[PDB]
Amino acid sequence: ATNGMRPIHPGEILRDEFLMEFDISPAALARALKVSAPTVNDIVREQRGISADMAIRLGRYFDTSAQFWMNLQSEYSLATAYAANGKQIEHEIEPLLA
Amino acid sequence: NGMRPIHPGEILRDEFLMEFDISPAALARALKVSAPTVNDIVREQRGISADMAIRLGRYFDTSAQFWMNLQSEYSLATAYAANGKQIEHEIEPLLAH
């Protein structure tokens, strides 16, 4: 059986481990981060990724590193990219032997 | 925080291209991407995409996250240098409230 990647959107972790944990609505989070409510709404709906600026805001608000959020984002972006082009990439790139 | 940016292209040049004596155009041909795609990264003009991270990991036998983690550190560092103090100023931490 071959390896695979299944995507987990960062907004799912935001919803489950932060918004639901502290009983914060997405709109209340947007007001606290000083961003537009659709900005947070898009993320929790899994319709937008975490930008660097947003990662710094979330880290500041929730006492995390900004990299925590960017690492969740990179995993999601890698999973979607892998499911789309990963098999072809592995088919056409011969690993370096040196 | 974190303010001093290290572009992923610097690591690519120093730890891989120069370590294995591989030119950027040679790398692009091995990765099956256009040469300006690799050039722009090596010259620190463009970042590493998810697709490129998978290609670089495949070729150099690293994880793809190795490259994406360097990219996010750079993106964070530039974002913080531009706006970090403004962000800290305008957001009150939840647990300070």
PDB file of N, CA, C and O in Angstrom, chain A residues 43-85:
ATOM      1  N   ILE A  43     -12.164  31.521   6.389  1.00  0.00           N
ATOM      2  CA  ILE A  43     -11.233  30.517   6.902  1.00  0.00           C
ATOM      3  C   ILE A  43     -11.987  29.381   7.589  1.00  0.00           C
ATOM      4  O   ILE A  43     -11.709  28.203   7.353  1.00  0.00           O
ATOM      5  N   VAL A  44     -12.941  29.711   8.464  1.00  0.00           N
ATOM      6  CA  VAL A  44     -13.637  28.650   9.183  1.00  0.00           C
ATOM      7  C   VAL A  44     -14.529  27.854   8.247  1.00  0.00           C
ATOM      8  O   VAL A  44     -14.825  26.691   8.528  1.00  0.00           O
ATOM      9  N   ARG A  45     -14.967  28.456   7.147  1.00  0.00           N
ATOM     10  CA  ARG A  45     -15.708  27.746   6.111  1.00  0.00           C
ATOM     11  C   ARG A  45     -14.793  26.983   5.165  1.00  0.00           C
ATOM     12  O   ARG A  45     -15.293  26.350   4.220  1.00  0.00           O
ATOM     13  N   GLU A  46     -13.475  27.042   5.391  1.00  0.00           N
ATOM     14  CA  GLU A  46     -12.491  26.329   4.570  1.00  0.00           C
ATOM     15  C   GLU A  46     -12.480  26.840   3.126  1.00  0.00           C
ATOM     16  O   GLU A  46     -12.226  26.083   2.182  1.00  0.00           O
ATOM     17  N   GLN A  47     -12.728  28.142   2.961  1.00  0.00           N
ATOM     18  CA  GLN A  47     -12.760  28.820   1.671  1.00  0.00           C
ATOM     19  C   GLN A  47     -11.613  29.799   1.508  1.00  0.00           C
ATOM     20  O   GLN A  47     -11.593  30.561   0.536  1.00  0.00           O
ATOM     21  N   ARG A  48     -10.671  29.808   2.442  1.00  0.00           N
ATOM     22  CA  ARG A  48      -9.533  30.707   2.361  1.00  0.00           C
ATOM     23  C   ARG A  48      -8.456  30.161   3.281  1.00  0.00           C
ATOM     24  O   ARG A  48      -8.768  29.607   4.336  1.00  0.00           O
ATOM     25  N   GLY A  49      -7.196  30.297   2.867  1.00  0.00           N
ATOM     26  CA  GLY A  49      -6.097  29.879   3.717  1.00  0.00           C
ATOM     27  C   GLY A  49      -5.666  30.949   4.707  1.00  0.00           C
ATOM     28  O   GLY A  49      -6.138  32.091   4.686  1.00  0.00           O
ATOM     29  N   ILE A  50      -4.753  30.550   5.595  1.00  0.00           N
ATOM     30  CA  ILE A  50      -4.139  31.455   6.566  1.00  0.00           C
ATOM     31  C   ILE A  50      -2.974  32.168   5.900  1.00  0.00           C
ATOM     32  O   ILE A  50      -1.993  31.531   5.498  1.00  0.00           O
ATOM     33  N   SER A  51      -3.069  33.488   5.803  1.00  0.00           N
ATOM     34  CA  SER A  51      -1.955  34.302   5.356  1.00  0.00           C
ATOM     35  C   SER A  51      -0.959  34.520   6.497  1.00  0.00           C
ATOM     36  O   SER A  51      -1.264  34.320   7.676  1.00  0.00           O
ATOM     37  N   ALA A  52       0.243  34.972   6.130  1.00  0.00           N
ATOM     38  CA  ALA A  52       1.244  35.287   7.146  1.00  0.00           C
ATOM     39  C   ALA A  52       0.715  36.316   8.129  1.00  0.00           C
ATOM     40  O   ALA A  52       0.895  36.169   9.340  1.00  0.00           O
ATOM     41  N   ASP A  53       0.076  37.372   7.619  1.00  0.00           N
ATOM     42  CA  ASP A  53      -0.456  38.411   8.497  1.00  0.00           C
ATOM     43  C   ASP A  53      -1.495  37.825   9.440  1.00  0.00           C
ATOM     44  O   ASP A  53      -1.466  38.089  10.643  1.00  0.00           O
ATOM     45  N   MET A  54      -2.365  36.951   8.918  1.00  0.00           N
ATOM     46  CA  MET A  54      -3.383  36.328   9.760  1.00  0.00           C
ATOM     47  C   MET A  54      -2.764  35.391  10.786  1.00  0.00           C
ATOM     48  O   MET A  54      -3.281  35.264  11.899  1.00  0.00           O
ATOM     49  N   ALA A  55      -1.679  34.697  10.420  1.00  0.00           N
ATOM     50  CA  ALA A  55      -1.013  33.808  11.369  1.00  0.00           C
ATOM     51  C   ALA A  55      -0.432  34.584  12.533  1.00  0.00           C
ATOM     52  O   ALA A  55      -0.448  34.115  13.679  1.00  0.00           O
ATOM     53  N   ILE A  56       0.130  35.757  12.252  1.00  0.00           N
ATOM     54  CA  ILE A  56       0.646  36.595  13.335  1.00  0.00           C
ATOM     55  C   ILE A  56      -0.495  37.063  14.237  1.00  0.00           C
ATOM     56  O   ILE A  56      -0.372  37.056  15.469  1.00  0.00           O
ATOM     57  N   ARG A  57      -1.633  37.439  13.644  1.00  0.00           N
ATOM     58  CA  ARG A  57      -2.782  37.865  14.438  1.00  0.00           C
ATOM     59  C   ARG A  57      -3.313  36.730  15.304  1.00  0.00           C
ATOM     60  O   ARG A  57      -3.590  36.921  16.490  1.00  0.00           O
ATOM     61  N   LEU A  58      -3.461  35.534  14.731  1.00  0.00           N
ATOM     62  CA  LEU A  58      -3.973  34.414  15.508  1.00  0.00           C
ATOM     63  C   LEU A  58      -3.000  34.009  16.602  1.00  0.00           C
ATOM     64  O   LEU A  58      -3.414  33.677  17.720  1.00  0.00           O
ATOM     65  N   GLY A  59      -1.702  34.007  16.297  1.00  0.00           N
ATOM     66  CA  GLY A  59      -0.723  33.707  17.330  1.00  0.00           C
ATOM     67  C   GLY A  59      -0.802  34.693  18.478  1.00  0.00           C
ATOM     68  O   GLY A  59      -0.790  34.303  19.647  1.00  0.00           O
ATOM     69  N   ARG A  60      -0.895  35.990  18.151  1.00  0.00           N
ATOM     70  CA  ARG A  60      -1.022  37.025  19.172  1.00  0.00           C
ATOM     71  C   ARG A  60      -2.276  36.828  20.012  1.00  0.00           C
ATOM     72  O   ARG A  60      -2.242  36.958  21.243  1.00  0.00           O
ATOM     73  N   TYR A  61      -3.398  36.532  19.366  1.00  0.00           N
ATOM     74  CA  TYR A  61      -4.658  36.452  20.095  1.00  0.00           C
ATOM     75  C   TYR A  61      -4.716  35.205  20.970  1.00  0.00           C
ATOM     76  O   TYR A  61      -5.140  35.265  22.127  1.00  0.00           O
ATOM     77  N   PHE A  62      -4.315  34.058  20.428  1.00  0.00           N
ATOM     78  CA  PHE A  62      -4.516  32.790  21.116  1.00  0.00           C
ATOM     79  C   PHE A  62      -3.278  32.261  21.841  1.00  0.00           C
ATOM     80  O   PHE A  62      -3.287  31.103  22.266  1.00  0.00           O
ATOM     81  N   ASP A  63      -2.223  33.064  21.999  1.00  0.00           N
ATOM     82  CA  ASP A  63      -0.995  32.614  22.662  1.00  0.00           C
ATOM     83  C   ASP A  63      -0.387  31.388  21.971  1.00  0.00           C
ATOM     84  O   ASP A  63      -0.127  30.360  22.594  1.00  0.00           O
ATOM     85  N   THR A  64      -0.183  31.488  20.665  1.00  0.00           N
ATOM     86  CA  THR A  64       0.573  30.476  19.936  1.00  0.00           C
ATOM     87  C   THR A  64       1.671  31.172  19.152  1.00  0.00           C
ATOM     88  O   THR A  64       1.678  32.396  19.008  1.00  0.00           O
ATOM     89  N   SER A  65       2.600  30.385  18.616  1.00  0.00           N
ATOM     90  CA  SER A  65       3.476  30.957  17.612  1.00  0.00           C
ATOM     91  C   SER A  65       2.682  31.207  16.333  1.00  0.00           C
ATOM     92  O   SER A  65       1.633  30.601  16.092  1.00  0.00           O
ATOM     93  N   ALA A  66       3.185  32.125  15.510  1.00  0.00           N
ATOM     94  CA  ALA A  66       2.586  32.295  14.195  1.00  0.00           C
ATOM     95  C   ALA A  66       2.865  31.087  13.314  1.00  0.00           C
ATOM     96  O   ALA A  66       2.030  30.724  12.480  1.00  0.00           O
ATOM     97  N   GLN A  67       4.011  30.436  13.521  1.00  0.00           N
ATOM     98  CA  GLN A  67       4.363  29.259  12.734  1.00  0.00           C
ATOM     99  C   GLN A  67       3.396  28.109  12.956  1.00  0.00           C
ATOM    100  O   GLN A  67       3.205  27.290  12.053  1.00  0.00           O
ATOM    101  N   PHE A  68       2.817  28.002  14.156  1.00  0.00           N
ATOM    102  CA  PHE A  68       1.802  26.978  14.402  1.00  0.00           C
ATOM    103  C   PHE A  68       0.735  27.014  13.319  1.00  0.00           C
ATOM    104  O   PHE A  68       0.403  25.985  12.719  1.00  0.00           O
ATOM    105  N   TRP A  69       0.218  28.213  13.028  1.00  0.00           N
ATOM    106  CA  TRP A  69      -0.823  28.355  12.016  1.00  0.00           C
ATOM    107  C   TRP A  69      -0.274  28.167  10.617  1.00  0.00           C
ATOM    108  O   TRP A  69      -0.944  27.578   9.767  1.00  0.00           O
ATOM    109  N   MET A  70       0.933  28.671  10.350  1.00  0.00           N
ATOM    110  CA  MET A  70       1.483  28.512   9.011  1.00  0.00           C
ATOM    111  C   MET A  70       1.827  27.061   8.744  1.00  0.00           C
ATOM    112  O   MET A  70       1.770  26.623   7.591  1.00  0.00           O
ATOM    113  N   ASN A  71       2.195  26.314   9.789  1.00  0.00           N
ATOM    114  CA  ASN A  71       2.477  24.890   9.606  1.00  0.00           C
ATOM    115  C   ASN A  71       1.204  24.123   9.276  1.00  0.00           C
ATOM    116  O   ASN A  71       1.222  23.205   8.447  1.00  0.00           O
ATOM    117  N   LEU A  72       0.079  24.487   9.907  1.00  0.00           N
ATOM    118  CA  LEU A  72      -1.189  23.862   9.536  1.00  0.00           C
ATOM    119  C   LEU A  72      -1.549  24.199   8.098  1.00  0.00           C
ATOM    120  O   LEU A  72      -2.027  23.341   7.344  1.00  0.00           O
ATOM    121  N   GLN A  73      -1.308  25.446   7.699  1.00  0.00           N
ATOM    122  CA  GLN A  73      -1.604  25.861   6.336  1.00  0.00           C
ATOM    123  C   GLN A  73      -0.735  25.114   5.335  1.00  0.00           C
ATOM    124  O   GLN A  73      -1.226  24.649   4.299  1.00  0.00           O
ATOM    125  N   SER A  74       0.561  24.999   5.619  1.00  0.00           N
ATOM    126  CA  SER A  74       1.438  24.315   4.678  1.00  0.00           C
ATOM    127  C   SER A  74       1.048  22.851   4.539  1.00  0.00           C
ATOM    128  O   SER A  74       1.088  22.292   3.433  1.00  0.00           O
ATOM    129  N   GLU A  75       0.673  22.201   5.646  1.00  0.00           N
ATOM    130  CA  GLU A  75       0.229  20.813   5.521  1.00  0.00           C
ATOM    131  C   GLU A  75      -0.975  20.712   4.592  1.00  0.00           C
ATOM    132  O   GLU A  75      -1.015  19.839   3.718  1.00  0.00           O
ATOM    133  N   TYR A  76      -1.947  21.622   4.743  1.00  0.00           N
ATOM    134  CA  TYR A  76      -3.135  21.607   3.891  1.00  0.00           C
ATOM    135  C   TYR A  76      -2.766  21.846   2.433  1.00  0.00           C
ATOM    136  O   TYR A  76      -3.227  21.130   1.532  1.00  0.00           O
ATOM    137  N   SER A  77      -1.938  22.862   2.179  1.00  0.00           N
ATOM    138  CA  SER A  77      -1.551  23.157   0.801  1.00  0.00           C
ATOM    139  C   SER A  77      -0.761  22.007   0.195  1.00  0.00           C
ATOM    140  O   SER A  77      -0.922  21.686  -0.991  1.00  0.00           O
ATOM    141  N   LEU A  78       0.109  21.380   0.990  1.00  0.00           N
ATOM    142  CA  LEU A  78       0.855  20.239   0.465  1.00  0.00           C
ATOM    143  C   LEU A  78      -0.067  19.073   0.166  1.00  0.00           C
ATOM    144  O   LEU A  78       0.110  18.377  -0.846  1.00  0.00           O
ATOM    145  N   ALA A  79      -1.053  18.830   1.033  1.00  0.00           N
ATOM    146  CA  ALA A  79      -1.943  17.690   0.807  1.00  0.00           C
ATOM    147  C   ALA A  79      -2.738  17.865  -0.481  1.00  0.00           C
ATOM    148  O   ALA A  79      -2.858  16.937  -1.291  1.00  0.00           O
ATOM    149  N   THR A  80      -3.301  19.056  -0.687  1.00  0.00           N
ATOM    150  CA  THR A  80      -4.083  19.291  -1.894  1.00  0.00           C
ATOM    151  C   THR A  80      -3.205  19.220  -3.136  1.00  0.00           C
ATOM    152  O   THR A  80      -3.591  18.611  -4.142  1.00  0.00           O
ATOM    153  N   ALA A  81      -2.013  19.820  -3.073  1.00  0.00           N
ATOM    154  CA  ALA A  81      -1.066  19.746  -4.183  1.00  0.00           C
ATOM    155  C   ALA A  81      -0.650  18.314  -4.458  1.00  0.00           C
ATOM    156  O   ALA A  81      -0.520  17.912  -5.623  1.00  0.00           O
ATOM    157  N   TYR A  82      -0.427  17.529  -3.399  1.00  0.00           N
ATOM    158  CA  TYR A  82      -0.025  16.139  -3.597  1.00  0.00           C
ATOM    159  C   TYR A  82      -1.141  15.332  -4.242  1.00  0.00           C
ATOM    160  O   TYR A  82      -0.888  14.518  -5.141  1.00  0.00           O
ATOM    161  N   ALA A  83      -2.375  15.509  -3.773  1.00  0.00           N
ATOM    162  CA  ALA A  83      -3.475  14.734  -4.345  1.00  0.00           C
ATOM    163  C   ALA A  83      -3.671  15.063  -5.814  1.00  0.00           C
ATOM    164  O   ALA A  83      -4.111  14.206  -6.592  1.00  0.00           O
ATOM    165  N   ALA A  84      -3.333  16.286  -6.211  1.00  0.00           N
ATOM    166  CA  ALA A  84      -3.499  16.720  -7.594  1.00  0.00           C
ATOM    167  C   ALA A  84      -2.328  16.289  -8.476  1.00  0.00           C
ATOM    168  O   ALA A  84      -2.537  15.684  -9.532  1.00  0.00           O
ATOM    169  N   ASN A  85      -1.088  16.594  -8.076  1.00  0.00           N
ATOM    170  CA  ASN A  85       0.060  16.396  -8.966  1.00  0.00           C
ATOM    171  C   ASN A  85       1.157  15.505  -8.394  1.00  0.00           C
ATOM    172  O   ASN A  85       2.164  15.275  -9.086  1.00  0.00           O
TER     173      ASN A  85
END
